[PDB]
Amino acid sequence: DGAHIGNYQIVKTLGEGSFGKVKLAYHTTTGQKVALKIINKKVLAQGRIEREISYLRLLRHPHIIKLYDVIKSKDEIIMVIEYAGNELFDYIVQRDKMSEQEARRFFQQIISAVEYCHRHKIVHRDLKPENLLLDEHLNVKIADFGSPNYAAPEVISGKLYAGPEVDVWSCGVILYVMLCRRLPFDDESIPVLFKNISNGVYTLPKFLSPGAAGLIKRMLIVNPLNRISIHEIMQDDWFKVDLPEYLL
C-alpha cells in the first residue's frame, strides 16, 4: 500500500471500488506512467479477468494498451497497464470539428489496431471513445476488451451473432463522429434510437468528402454480409492517403 513496488513508484490512487482500487505509478528507471489495477477474493462474485490478461498479453501493437506485468498472489491480482491520461472522447468534445486529415490520422490508427485483434481471432465488441484512449503524442490506444450509440445492430439485439463485422460498424460511427461532431443515430428516445440503429437510418452530411462519405456509407450497413471488411477498408483510396508505413 506502499509507495513502491519492484520498479514502480506509487503516486496516488486515481479511483476506487469493490475490488477496484486503481493506483497510478511509474517505472523507476524508464519513467513510463502506469496504472495498477488491483483485484482479489471479492472477484469470487473471474473469467473476464483472465480474458483481459491473456488478451492484453497476446496483443503487442502501437495502438493497443500495453500490459507490462501481471503480479499474482493468493489474494491479489495486480495488473501493470500502460497509462494514457485522456480519452479520444475528450479530444473530440473540447475542440470543435476536426479536419478530414486529422480523423484519417486517428482512424488509420484505430482500424490498424482492430485489424490486428481480428487477425488474432479477438473481436472488441465495445469500441467507442472512452475505450479509445490518447497518450500525450496524441496516439490512440484501445483500452478495454455509457453509450448504445456505436453498437452494431447485431449487438443491440441478442439473437444474431457478433462477428468482426461488428467492430467495423463501431469504427464507422467513430469516423462519422470525428467528422461530423454529431452521432449518426443519437436520439433522446431510447426506442427511436434502437429502431434507427437496426434500420441504419442516418444522415450523411453533404459537407463530407466523397471519399469519407463513401467509406462511412459502407461501414453502416445493417446486413453484416454487405458491410465492408477490415481488409477492404485498408484498400480504400481515401483511407490509404498518408497512411504511415508502420501501420502496415
From Swiss-Prot:
Describe the effect of residue 37 to R. Answer: Inactivates the kinase activity without affecting protein levels
Q: Would you say which domain of life the source belongs to?
A: Eukaryota
Q: Which residues form the Protein kinase domain?
A: 8-239
Residue sites binding ATP per the record: 14-22, 37
Additional information: Present with 589 molecules/cell in log phase SD medium.
Know the name of this protein? Carbon catabolite-derepressing protein kinase
Please report what switches on or represses expression of this protein.
Answer: Expression of the SNF1 gene itself is not glucose repressible.
Quaternary structure, per UniProt, is: Component of the AMP-activated protein kinase complex also known as the SNF1 kinase complex (Snf1c), a heterotrimeric complex composed of an alpha subunit (SNF1), a regulatory subunit beta (GAL83 and substoichiometric alternate beta subunits SIP1 and SIP2), and a regulatory subunit gamma (SNF4). Interacts with the transcriptional activator SIP4. Interacts with SAK1. Interacts with CTK1: Interacts with adenylate cyclase CYR1.
The catalytic site is made up of: 126
What job does this protein perform? Serine/threonine protein kinase essential for release from glucose repression. Catalytic subunit of the AMP-activated protein kinase complex also known as the SNF1 kinase complex (Snf1c), a central regulator of cellular energy homeostasis, which, in response to a fall in intracellular ATP levels, activates energy-producing pathways and inhibits energy-consuming processes. The complex phosphorylates histone H3 to form H3S10ph, which promotes H3K14ac formation, leading to transcriptional activation through TBP recruitment to the promoters.
Q: What's written under domain?
A: The regulatory domain (RS) also called auto-inhibitory domain (AID) inhibits kinase activity of the protein kinase domain (KD). The AID is sequestered by SNF4 within the AMP-activated protein kinase complex which might correspond to the activated SNF1 form. The ubiquitin-associated domain (UBA) localized within the AID dampens kinase activation, probably by restraining SNF1-SNF4 associations. Moreover, the UBA domain influences life span in a FKH1- and FKH2-dependent mechanism.
Gene that specifies this protein: SNF1
Q: Where in the cell is it found?
A: Cytoplasm; Nucleus; Nucleus membrane
Which Cys-Cys disulphide bridges does the record give?
A: none
